[PDB]
A paper describes a structure:
While the S, M, and E proteins mainly contribute to the outer shell structure of the virus particle, the N protein forms the viral capsid by packaging the viral RNA genome into a helical ribonucleoprotein (RNP) complex. These two domains are connected by a highly flexible linker region (residues 175–246), and at either end of these domains are intrinsically disordered regions, namely the N-arm (at the N-terminus; residues 1–48) and the C-tail (at the C-terminus; residues 365–419).
Our crystallization efforts resulted in a high-resolution (1.55 Å) structure of the N-NTD with a small part of the N-arm in complex with ssDNA. The crystallization of only the N-terminal part of the full-length N protein, after an extended period, led us to hypothesize that the full-length N protein might have been digested in the crystallization condition, with only the N-terminal part crystallizing under the given condition. The N-NTD resembles a right-handed fist, containing a core of four-stranded antiparallel ß-sheets (ß1-ß5-ß2-ß6), which is sandwiched between two loops, a short 310 helix (η), and a protruding ß-hairpin (ß3 and ß4) between ß2 and ß5. Our crystal structure revealed that the N-NTD, along with part of the flexible N-arm, arranges in a specific pattern where the N-arm extends to neighboring molecules and anchors between two molecules through significant hydrogen bonding. The Watson–Crick face of ssDNA interacts with the protein through direct and water-mediated hydrogen bonds as well as π–π stacking. T0 also stacks with Y109 through π–π stacking.
Author numbering: 39 to 173
Write the structure that this text describes.
Amino acid sequence: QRRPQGLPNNTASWFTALTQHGKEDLKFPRGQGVPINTNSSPDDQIGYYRRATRRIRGGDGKMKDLSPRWYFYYLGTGPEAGLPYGANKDGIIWVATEGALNTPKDHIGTRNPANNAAIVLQLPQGTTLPKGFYA
């Protein structure tokens, strides 16, 4: 009758991931890399990508890494919500559109996948990507 339910996951990226197909980490030149979000202000255009690598058990019973995925989070949100903009950390890269305000984006926050689908991550036409990334 009463089907169990856990605490909600409220911490997902609003956007789909950028999959790393090659050997190069994600990186963006200064001023590039913030995904398109038409429901945001110029003040809002700042955050980080965080690498996540999924592992699966192969046929041999041994663990294999899949292609790394890089997920975008607005500044002050997500798994590294505490970090100030530009805090270097392995697996983190920082991006900001010129004019963004260096303040946490609590008014955007993160996504509950049970309630909202991810937005396809789109970048402005002309954005530079490293080899191994496509958008």
